[PDB]
Design a protein around this ligand. Structure first.
Ligand SMILES: C[S@@+](CC[C@H](N)C(=O)[O-])C[C@H]1O[C@@H](n2cnc3c(N)ncnc32)[C@H](O)[C@@H]1O
Ligand SMILES: *C(=O)CCCC[C@@H](S)CC
Ligand code: SF4
Ligand code: F3S
Length: 292
């Protein structure tokens, strides 16, 4: 039981924030920020000085078919069916908020035959046909290794394909649902490079789940062997008392250390920090390292 000082946040202020909160409920859309109970809700939904207010619309309802021990998203054996109007409503809300870069994610839908690859592809297609110059990033589930489902999402005009390994291979069984493993997540990023050679790969790992420095170095080196372009490192924070406890709060100095090691291995940009999540300032990192 430890409580750190550098992981403290603020109660969400509602200057430019209720516009996003009321838009998500007008279209009956969900977001991973509210379900996962992220502390960076105020920073991402409301730019302090000059930060475009962005969000992470979570598709296919607020209930996941999997039960990951680090995630607080609701889990049910059979979630409600797909909403056909979700891909169309998402494209309207994103263009309404004036975003030049958007990130989209969804819960795992193991009950769907394609796992929702067609539903995600229609959300990106409706969003790119409406605004061709907008940048889209998809935080895609593993689809249980369905190479056809991964191909359908990667060929939807996607700019950055994102799928997280979450933690080191030695902690896949304790942290993630058994339907997801380390080698499976790498085959999601590898196949996205084969089907779409000009795509940008991106993944996110979490620290504080019992991993050591030796295990983290081998994971990043294996990701570079998978030709993964981008990497994200962040401190795992306990969502609820029912979930996993934090094992070790990584110091901000060591968080900066892995940023240099990522630059050594050749990662196009390594975003590391205690509060750094997968989509945390993802558009700001795109403008600083992925142009030229
Ligand atoms: C809910 S997942 C959605 C992607 C997809 N459903 C999957 O997991 O394969 C979105 C992100 O939230 C993050 N997340 C959930 N709970 C977290 C926590 N307690 N601390 C840090 N990150 C968390 C995970 O890292 C994950 O990458
Ligand atoms: C608490 O740590 C949950 C963090 C959720 C991060 C979402 S908003 C983006 C990956
Ligand atoms: S797959 Fe795991 S991390 Fe993703 S929404 Fe479901 S329980 Fe949460
Ligand atoms: S990193 Fe930002 S996009 Fe969800 Fe968390 S609030």
């Amino acid at each position: 039981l430890r409580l750190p000082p550098w992981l403290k946040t603020e109660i969400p202020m509602g200057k430019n924030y209720n516009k996003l909160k009321n838009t998500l409920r007008n279209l009956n859309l969900h977001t991973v920020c509210e379900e996962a109970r992220c502390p960076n809700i105020g920073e991402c939904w409301g730019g302090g000085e000059y930060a475009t207010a962005t969000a992470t619309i979570m598709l296919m309802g607020d209930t996941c078919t999997r039960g990951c021990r680090f995630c607080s998203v609701k889990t049910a054996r059979n979630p409600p069916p797909l909403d056909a109007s979700e891909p169309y409503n998402t494209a309207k809300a994103i263009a309404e908020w004036g975003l030049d870069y958007v990130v989209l994610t969804s819960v795992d839908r193991d009950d769907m035959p394609d796992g929702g690859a067609e539903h995600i592809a229609k959300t990106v297609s409706y969003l790119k046909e409406r605004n061709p110059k907008i940048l889209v990033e998809c935080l895609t589930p593993d689809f249980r290794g369905d190479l056809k489902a991964i191909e359908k999402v990667a060929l939807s005009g996607l700019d950055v394909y994102a799928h997280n390994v979450e933690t080191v291979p030695e902690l896949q069984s304790k942290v993630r649902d058994p339907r997801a493993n380390f080698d499976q997540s790498l085959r999601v990023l590898k196949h996205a490079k084969k089907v779409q050679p000009d795509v940008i790969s991106k993944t996110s790992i979490m620290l504080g789940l019992g991993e050591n420095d030796e295990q983290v170095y081998a994971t990043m080196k294996a990701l570079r062997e998978a030709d993964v372009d981008c990497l994200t490192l962040g401190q795992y924070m306990q969502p609820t008392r029912r979930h996993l406890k934090v094992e070790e709060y990584i110091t901000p100095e060591k968080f900066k250390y892995w940023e240099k090691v990522g630059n050594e291995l050749g990662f196009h940009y390594t975003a590391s920090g205690p509060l750094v999540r997968s989509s945390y300032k993802a558009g700001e990192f795109f403008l600083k390292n992925l142009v030229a």
